[PDB]
Amino acid sequence: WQVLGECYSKTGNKVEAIKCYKRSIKASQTVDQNTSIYYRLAQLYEELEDLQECKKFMMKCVDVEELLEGIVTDETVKARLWLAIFEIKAGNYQLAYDYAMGVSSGTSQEIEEARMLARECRRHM
Amino acid sequence: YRLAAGISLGLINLGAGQTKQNVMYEDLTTKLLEIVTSTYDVENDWIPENSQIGAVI
Fold this sequence. Notes:
The structure is cut from a larger assembly and holds chains A and B. By secondary structure, chain A is mainly alpha-helical. In chain A, about 75% of the residues lie in helices and about 0% in strands. Chain A starts with a helix and ends with a helix. By secondary structure, chain B is mainly alpha-helical. The two termini of chain B are about 15 Å apart. Chains A and B meet through helix 7 of A and loops of B. Chain B: The APC/C is composed of at least 13 subunits that stay tightly associated throughout the cell cycle: APC1, APC2, APC4, APC5, APC9, APC11, CDC16, CDC23, CDC26, CDC27, DOC1, MND2 and SWM1. APC1 interacts directly with MND2. Chain B: Belongs to the APC1 family. Chain B: It is found in: Nucleus; Cytoplasm; Cytoplasm, Cytoskeleton, Spindle pole.
């Protein structure tokens, strides 16, 4: 099912690719395997100009990390960086500060992106 | 070369001064002001007057 979603995504059929990934999520036996799908699924909603809808899926992918005693995986690193960036535009600096700190153990570019964001929100905190 | 360095520093951090990073911007600002306002009775080798325009720019 996940492969079918990629083909639809690559052919400009965003309306169908949304439904394809949701079916894949149910078939997965373990929640941890849904970490990769959630981030890509959130991106497709971002291409479907509705930023509010993709927030709920961004909550779930990030929350899986907490439910897995801090899995700290790569595809959640991009989730926290994107989530914190949007929270700055929402004016809630306090709710965005912890997101940067939690992702401070990723790649070289990941940590610096959150570190500068941490300084920005701390000043307005 | 110092004029090029001054314009370089100014262009990289364009629009970073409207702060009410702030600590580090304040440190950089006070360092540049120290460069532009320092008066030396004896010419120091590694801070000549050639960098004044770059600090000002």
